[PDB]
Structure of Ribonuclease pancreatic:
Amino acid sequence: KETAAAKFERQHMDSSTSAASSSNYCNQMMKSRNLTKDRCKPVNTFVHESLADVQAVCSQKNVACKNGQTNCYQSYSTMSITDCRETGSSKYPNCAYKTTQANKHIIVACEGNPYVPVHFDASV
């Protein structure tokens, strides 16, 4: 089954664009990345950076995750991100999202050898 690292990349990485190009970015990406298949995922963040730059966060500033786990890390730098969260009209299977552009630090949880992101915890 899909590894946690691979699921992180599918859910959260978008190295192919520098930022969201339109209000329909989230609608399209949430669909394309299969985050609407079984239910409407309520909130999601995409990171517009190289994969290596995001993986490198696992060697940056340690911080406890929202859930208290201690394997979370904050990026030293801000990153281009897109926040996606459901609109009031979102109704499965017609999932609908608001796209918001931002430049923020990210917080990810890391696991494994190589030690890589497995969960997107927050934009801050």
Observations:
- The domain at 1-124 is CATH 3.10.130.10 (P-30 Protein).
- Strands lie at 43-47, 61-63, 72-74, 79-86, 97-104, 106-111, 116-123.
- The longest strand covers residues 79-86.
- The chain has one domain: 1-124.
